[PDB]
């Protein structure tokens, strides 16, 4: 729900930002239309075309105000003031970004070290694309297919899954994709018994 | 001490319009009591001169339409400086004045008449008075940029990264 | 085509398969490159859909970070859509990519709007979209059709605006 | 008029890019991150170009005097005229400006040659020193 709230907030914020920006184009499209009608026709919105025949903006001349110490030094030190504020906000945003990056990054080094020191060597290993997920996951070929077995029903392929809850490693076979639970070990544990 | 800019400054005089009403005849009379009317302008000097004497495209159209405007030239040509003159009028609600200053350069070698130079823009809309577009554009753009910054920082907060997938939401 | 001698095969009025007269269509390097890239990616998508029928990643191709990455994506596209039997297409695509004045679709649309707002000939418009000229006289000499047809101030304004529109690499 | 014409075309393409990013954000499903970055960077650099070009032609924009058309009727379109001819910031920008003045301690109508001027001179030198220091640091290690 907070994601929906923030998405609506950013939508309305960008709409507010663009509403004032539209008026700039509305006021400035008039000059070319006055100078050249045909080029200017398309610039304005249909409502503004209906409002008036566009010849609105015409060139005019006004002199530049006489300069003095009074406003430039105040303006440039006021701009120094605004850019010192931008530097402050720059440092603060960079600090927040680096704190977030450091925390997350050390988290994935924690998981990374768990993966590195949890994996042994063991058998023939590759990457496969999951039928359901479509991503790349590690898989191990354990089957006797290369050992001379003619059993075509099963390929002896087990996908490696890092257990989120226990931070351990588990093997999921290809064939038994129906049992989805923690009781897989006992549900699949079969045996051969000889009775005399 | 905080001052509201005179460009956005808007004066309302309900008593004057109630007593006299809005007309081109007294539009300058309506403007007289406003803060925008400088007391150092030659128009006020002409006003006291008249008072003492009594006690003792559309520019050419409005030129030829009114005789008091004539009297305005024949009383204003003698005095050079900051003066208030009408720009255009469309009845019964719209009037705009022309804010210009005159320097009657009568020096030898200049065949042109007195120099007329603009100073300000004033628009009389109804009973209200209005007085840079560059500032408007920059203000709109900067507020848009502020809103964009807020939206983008929120979106970056929403962003979450994982090494094995990339960035997702 | 110094004297706009386009011949019968390339007349301004074209007769389509529907029998209606149409304006002759001319595209510069950017427009032609974008059109051919769009056609190739659409054909690749159709091929993938057909293969899925018989039996995400495409967003990264159109949006290229750099020229070299764009060229690598172009090579992959040609390998997966053309078969490598057409060297002339590869040479034309490389020439388009190396000397494409404009990479973004919106900027190309801006250039098209600026050039064809005046209503010039499609040949002249495409030439101006292909050639970047510093001065109006340079374009007028290098484009003899533009002589006597466009004012020098307008040509200078168009050229300066186009030079400003060029996206920095 | 040429400067305002260039201002117009560039502002129009900027508004077109804003409309673009708007109608690709308005979708109920968010596209890939990379497309959003590309759109952001393009539109934002375009805003930079807008600012730079607005900065270049300040004199042409200042010389132009605004006047309503004789044919334009104000009696019926006074609301539209007053929509365009008023130009104050949003209040959250002016209160942000006042909070920035208060937080920085900056105020620019009474400043004179005493302590603030010796602080102003003592600030120039840190920038130059840091620039020279980082030039030296870059030169210390071969980066090619």
């Amino acid at each position: 729900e907070q994601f929906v709230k923030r998405r609506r907030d950013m939508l309305e914020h960008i709409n507010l930002a663009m509403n004032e920006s539209s008026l700039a184009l509305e006021f400035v499209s008039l000059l070319l239309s006055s100078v050249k009608e045909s080029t200017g026709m398309s610039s304005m919105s249909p409502f503004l075309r209906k409002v008036v025949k566009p010849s609105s903006l015409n060139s005019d001349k006004i002199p530049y105000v006489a300069p003095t110490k009074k406003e430039y030094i105040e303006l440039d030190i006021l701009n120094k003031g605004w850019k010192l504020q931008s530097l402050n906000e720059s440092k603060d945003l960079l600090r927040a970004s680096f704190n977030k990056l450091s925390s997350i990054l050390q988290n994935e080094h924690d998981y990374w070290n768990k993966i590195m020191q949890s994996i042994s060597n063991k058998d023939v290993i590759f990457k496969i694309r999951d039928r359901t997920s479509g991503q790349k996951l590690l898989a191990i070929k354990y089957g006797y297919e290369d050992s001379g077995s003619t059993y075509k029903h099963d390929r002896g392929i087990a996908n490696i899954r890092n257990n989120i809850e226990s931070q351990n490693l588990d093997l999921i076979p290809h064939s038994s994709s129906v049992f989805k639970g923690t009781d897989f070990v006992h549900s699949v544990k079969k045996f051969l018994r000889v009775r005399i | 001490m905080n001052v509201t800019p005179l460009d956005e400054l808007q004066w309302k005089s309900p008593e004057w319009i109630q007593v006299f009403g809005l007309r081109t005849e007294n539009v300058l009379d309506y403007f007289a009591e406003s803060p925008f009317f400088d007391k150092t302008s030659n128009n006020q000097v002409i006003k006291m001169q008249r008072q003492f004497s009594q006690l003792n495209p559309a520019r050419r159209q409005i030129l030829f339409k009114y005789p008091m405007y004539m009297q305005l030239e024949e009383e204003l040509m003698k005095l050079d400086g900051t003066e208030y003159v009408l720009s255009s009028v469309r009845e019964p609600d719209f009037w705009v004045i022309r804010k210009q200053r005159r320097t009657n350069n009568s020096g030898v070698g200049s065949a042109k008449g007195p120099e007329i130079i603009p100073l300000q823009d004033y628009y009389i809309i109804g009973a209200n008075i209005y007085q840079t577009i560059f500032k408007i554009v920059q203000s709109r753009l900067m507020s848009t940029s502020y809103h964009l910054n807020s939206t983008l920082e929120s979106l970056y907060d929403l962003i979450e990264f994982q090494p094995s997938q990339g960035v997702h939401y | 085509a110094a004297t706009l001698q386009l011949g019968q095969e390339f007349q301004l009025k074209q007769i389509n398969h529907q029998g209606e007269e149409e304006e002759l269509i001319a595209l510069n390097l950017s427009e032609a490159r974008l059109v051919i890239k769009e056609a190739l990616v659409e054909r690749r998508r159709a091929f993938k859909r057909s293969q899925k029928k018989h039996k995400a990643d495409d967003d990264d191709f159109m949006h290229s970070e750099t020229r070299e990455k764009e060229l690598e994506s172009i090579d992959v596209l040609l390998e997966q859509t053309t078969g490598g039997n057409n060297k002339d297409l590869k040479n034309t695509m490389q020439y388009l990519t190396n000397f494409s004045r404009f990479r973004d679709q919106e900027t190309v649309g801006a250039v098209i709007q600026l050039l064809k707002s005046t209503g010039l000939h499609p040949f002249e418009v495409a030439q101006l979209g292909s050639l970047a000229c510093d001065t109006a006289d340079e374009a007028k000499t290098l484009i003899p059709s533009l002589n006597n047809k466009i004012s020098d101030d307008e040509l200078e304004r168009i050229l300066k605006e186009l030079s400003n529109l060029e996206t920095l690499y | 008029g040429q400067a305002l014409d260039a201002v117009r075309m560039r502002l129009a393409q900027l508004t077109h890019s804003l409309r673009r990013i708007r109608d690709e954000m308005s979708k109920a499903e968010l596209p890939q991150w990379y497309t959003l970055q590309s759109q952001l960077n393009v539109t934002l650099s375009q805003l930079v170009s807008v600012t730079s070009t607005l900065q270049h032609f300040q004199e042409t924009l200042d010389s132009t005097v605004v006047y309503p058309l004789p044919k334009f009727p104000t009696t019926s379109h006074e609301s539209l005229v007053t929509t365009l001819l008023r130009k104050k910031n949003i209040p959250e920008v002016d209160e942000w400006m006042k909070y920035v003045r208060e937080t920085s301690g900056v105020t620019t109508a009474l400043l004179k040659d005493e302590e603030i001027e010796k602080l102003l001179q003592q600030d120039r030198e840190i920038t130059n020193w840091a620039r020279t220091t980082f030039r030296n640091e870059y030169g210390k290690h071969d980066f090619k």
Binding site: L23, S43, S45, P46 | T4, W11 | - | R19, T82
Partner: peptide, 25 residues
């Protein structure tokens, strides 16, 4: 020509922030 015109983005609902103060005589 012109690929597409701009959609009308008028905001009459905007309340405006015109400061009104010199009303008293």
């Amino acid at each position: 020509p012109s690929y597409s015109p701009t959609s009308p983005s008028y905001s009459p609902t905007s309340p405006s922030y015109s400061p009104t103060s010199p009303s008293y005589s």
